[PDB]
Structures are given as C-alpha cells and as structure tokens.
Write a structure and sequence with these properties.
Layout: E1 2-4, E2 8-12, E3 15-21, E4 27-31, E5 36-41, E6 46-53, E7 60-69, E8 72-82, E9 86-94, E10 102-109, E11 112-124, E12 131-140, E13 146-150, H1 151-160, E14 167-178, E15 182-188
Parallel strand pairs: 9-12
Antiparallel strand pairs: 1-4, 2-3, 3-6, 4-5, 5-15, 6-14, 7-13, 7-15, 8-9, 8-14, 10-11, 11-12
C-alpha cells in the first residue's frame, strides 16, 4: 500500500482523500483497499486525514474503525462549507479531550444521542485562508467506533439551532489529532 506524508488531496481506490499536518513526517496515512486508510502518528502537531468526498452532502455513511489515540484525537465525519464558511465535525470517538463549545441542544440519530455545540475561530486558518468562521459540532455522548451516520439528521438539528451551512466543500471520515501519538484504521462504506 501507498503511504502519504505530504500534504495533499487526491483519489484512491474510488474515494477522495485528504491529508494535512503542520508537523510533516511525524504522521503518515496509508491508503488501503476501497474506502479504507490507516494513520500512524508519533509526537505530532496537528493533523487531519481521511477518505470521503470532494463535495459533501446529506449522505448516509457507514464506517468501521480501529481507533487508538494515546492523547488528544478525534474519529469524526469532518467537512467544510463556503458562504457561509463553516467547518463541521460529527465526533464519534475521542481520546483524552472531549470537544465542546457553546451548548446548542442535542440530536438523537443512528442509535446514539449527540450534544450539539458551536465554536468560533478568529483570524484562523481555513479552506479560504485566514478567516473568522463557525465550527458546528455533534459530539456523541458516549464513544463509538463503528456504525452509520445519517448526516442530514445532524445538518437539520444544527439548522433548528440556528447553525446554518453553506455550499459544500470536502467531507471526509477523518482521524484528527493534536500532539502525542497513536494510530487508526478507518473504513467507509
């Protein structure tokens, strides 16, 4: 299999993929069969890696993962929209840090209940450069590492809470990490 360490996007085995880190060489992504990839990180900075789609939408995504963070990492359906500029995360599992923000309610979907949060980033990196923008979160109340994500149920719950999305940019089933070490294997279907 091919192992990626350069920041890049592309297509692999039928799927869009994206890999990014601010600490090159401390994290890799190995591209596997079909909708699968693995990651390995050691004393890293920030990274995001995943397979998915170059343009997001209201997909119903089934995934299966092995997820082994030593510290802070998320297993998350992650994406962006433009105009409004929004990053969003449906967080299925996490490591030592459970992400939270301004509490906006809950959504029950796919056998779980998720807390909804909004955060803001100011003068921060984005798909469009240095910007100020919202992050929308659905964070599962208990961790899970496989199942189905009915993305539209999250989008609709966010909209009911006044959290509005724009035109879709990329959308990936991601491993995202901040410091420390770990590994994952994530398979979408």
């Amino acid at each position: 299999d091919t192992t990626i360490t350069q920041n890049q996007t592309g297509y692999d085995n039928g799927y869009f993929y994206s890999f990014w880190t601010d600490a090159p060489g401390t994290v890799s992504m190995t591209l596997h069969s079909g909708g699968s990839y693995s990651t390995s990180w050691r004393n890293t900075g920030h990274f995001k890696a995943g397979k998915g789609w170059s343009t997001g939408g209201r997909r119903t995504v089934t995934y299966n993962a092995s997820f082994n963070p030593s510290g802070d990492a998320y297993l998350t359906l992650y994406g962006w929209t433009r105009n409004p500029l929004v990053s969003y995360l449906i967080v299925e599992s996490w490591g030592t840090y459970r992400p939270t923000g301004t509490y906006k309610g809950t959504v029950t979907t796919d056998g779980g209940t998720y807390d909804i949060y909004e955060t803001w980033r100011y003068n921060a990196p984005s798909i469009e450069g240095t910007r100020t923008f919202q992050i929308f979160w659905s964070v599962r109340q208990q961790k899970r590492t496989s199942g189905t994500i009915t993305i539209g149920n999250h989008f609709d719950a966010w909209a009911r809470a006044g959290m509005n999305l724009g035109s879709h940019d990329y959308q990936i089933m991601a491993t995202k990490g901040w410091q420390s070490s770990g590994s994952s294997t994530v398979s979408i279907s």
